[PDB]
Amino acid sequence: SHPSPQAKPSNPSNPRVFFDVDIGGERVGRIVLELFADIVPKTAENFRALCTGEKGIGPTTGKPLHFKGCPFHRIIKKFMIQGGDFSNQNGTGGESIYGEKFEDENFHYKHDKEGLLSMANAGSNTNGSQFFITTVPTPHLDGKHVVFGQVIKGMGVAKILENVEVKGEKPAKLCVIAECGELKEGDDWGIFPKDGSGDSHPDFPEDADVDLKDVDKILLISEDLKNIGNTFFKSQNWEMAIKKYTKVLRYVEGSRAAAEDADGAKLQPVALSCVLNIGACKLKMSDWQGAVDSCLE
């Protein structure tokens, strides 16, 4: 059991798949997932195929072997998001592409952070189609659930999902995979908002292909966004206008968090070390003068 990969993705050959998420009939956005085929190929392939639907009808359930239209039936804030029961939509169903249940391939990765994709199960070797996305480190699960991918785009969408109203652990509004599938190398991420607004920027700035600390570029994006908002404003589409306006604020906040983090991670340490060395240097010099004092004294 090892730390999950930090790079997004961990490996460019690994499958990239997606979920377009709707809540209360509202399109929230896209989650893009990397599947760790390199580590758990058999677990990755089952999930990958369940994203395309390409295997057709499932023999033990009679439903399509597909996550399309599959709701998230169990959500616990500060823990995880669970879905994949496309046959019973309540955690008792679903099925793999190999038969109902296949074995725990391995437990090579730890649930060491948010955004990890892991197999739900009902004990050893009961993997089906059900899965969860963690929203925090979930170490108690290690060795009991196979981790087999991670979020690489749209964690902000996972965040919104994490926060829906629930009754018990069942979401009050319907939380569903409106669409899903696999991305070809080079396809577009499909993470700009599918709203016809001409807005090409990802819903969350951390997903954009831009150095967020580059202030001039963020203002270009912000100006675009604000123009789009003004257009909605001109069309009396206030809610859509507020959406766009709110999005530049997200981009401005992302830029600031980016600058701050990088500073704390990279410059603060080296500045700390320099001040430490200076204090050392100050001792050396006071010592050399103490020594010289006595002498010439």
Q: Which residues pair with 180 in a beta bridge?
A: 19
- Judged by DSSP in three states, 27 sits in strand
Please state, in angstroms and rounded to a whole number, the distance separating the CA atoms of residues 26 and 225: 21
- Active-site residue, selected from the candidate residues 18, 36, 132, 192: 132
**Selected catalytic residue, list 14, 46, 89, 121:** 121
Among 102, 204, 110, CA closest to 148 = 110
Answer whether 43's CB lies under 8 Å from 53's CB: no
Residues 10, 91: Cα–Cα separation, whole Å: 30
Q: Is 131 a catalytic residue?
A: no
CB atoms within 10 A of CB 288: 10
CB 81 within 8 A of CB 135: yes
- The position carrying tokens 């169903």 is 93
Contact by Cβ (8 Å): 221, 192:
no
> Active site includes 74?
yes
Domains along the sequence of the chain with CATH = 1-184 (2.40.100.10), 213-297 (1.10.150.160)
Q: What is the resolution of the experimental data for this entry, in Å?
A: 2.0
- According to DSSP, the β-strands at 74-76 and 80-83 are antiparallel
Annotated catalytic residue 148: no
Beta-sheet strands, E only, within 108-246: 116-119, 131-134, 147-153, 166-167, 170-171, 175-183
Is 121 catalytic? The answer is: yes
